Amino acid sequence: FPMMTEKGTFIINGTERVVVSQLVRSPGVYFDETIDKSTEKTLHSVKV
Amino acid sequence: EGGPGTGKTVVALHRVAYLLYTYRKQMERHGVLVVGPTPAFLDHIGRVL
């Protein structure tokens, strides 16, 4: 298993590499409202 | 449904105005449909709204 050094980096095949954090949408439940393209009405939706 | 001479029309127009004002924020996109022999109700809606 590759191990992290005291500097917060990895060594792979002699090269020094860094794994950057990733911003991702959390596994929540999200409600939203949008404007219909055709009728211009307000459409409410939710996705889990 | 009021009988003759009771002026139910005025009460109906006032009720329509009150309802459309109170729920205006959730009716400005759905719209309002007026059905009847004459558009007098639409005339009042335009007059007040």
Radius of gyration in angstroms for the set of CA atoms belonging to chain B, rounded to a whole number: 12
**Main-chain phi, psi angles of A6, to 5 degrees:** -70, -15
Beta bridge partners of A47: A30
Mutation for testing the B interface, residue in A33, A38, A40, A42 having most B CBs under 10 Å: A42
Instruction: Give the rounded distance of the alpha carbon of B25 from its chain centre.
Output: 17
Method used for this model? cryo-EM
Alpha helices (H) along chain B: 8-22, 40-48
CB spacing of A40 vs B30 below 8 angstroms: no
Does B29 contact A at CB distance below 8 Å? yes
Q: Cβ atoms within 10 A of the Cβ of B8, count?
A: 13
Maximum pairwise Cα distance, chain B? 36
Tell me which chain A residue has its CA closest to the CA of residue B31: A41
Helix (H, G, I), strand (E, B) or coil at A35: strand
Tokens representing A42 are 């307000």
A18 contact partners, CB below 8 Å, separation of at least 6: A8, A9, A10
Helix (H, G, I), strand (E, B) or coil at B26: helix
